[PDB]
């Protein structure tokens, strides 16, 4: 079985929530969880990896993510 990697999600206010995901995980599931925990609609947010938009069906493998990589969350434009 594949291992989880731990990603740090940083919000507009510098708060952090870490997520464990597999390399094959579609990141919509992370986005949904994050939005839930912030008490806001998922479509009000955009999630960036190294400044690039993370798609619902992006995986960490597709994005070249590794342990301790950072996702930033901004308001949708």
């Amino acid at each position: 079985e594949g291992e989880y990697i731990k990603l740090k999600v940083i919000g507009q206010d510098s708060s952090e929530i870490h997520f464990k995901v597999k390399m094959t995980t579609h990141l919509k599931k992370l986005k949904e969880s994050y939005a839930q925990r912030q008490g806001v609609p998922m479509n009000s947010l955009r999630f960036l990896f190294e400044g690039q938009r993370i798609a619902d069906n992006h995986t960490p493998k597709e994005l070249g993510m590794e342990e301790e990589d950072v996702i930033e969350v901004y308001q949708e434009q």
Binding site: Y4, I17, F19, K20, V21, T25, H26, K29, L30, S33
Partner: peptide, 17 residues
């Protein structure tokens, strides 16, 4: 804040509805 780690889990004939 305390550390927060969330585990994202992977992606029927018993059903009754």
């Amino acid at each position: 804040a305390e550390e927060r780690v969330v585990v994202i889990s992977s992606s029927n004939s018993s059903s009754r509805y």
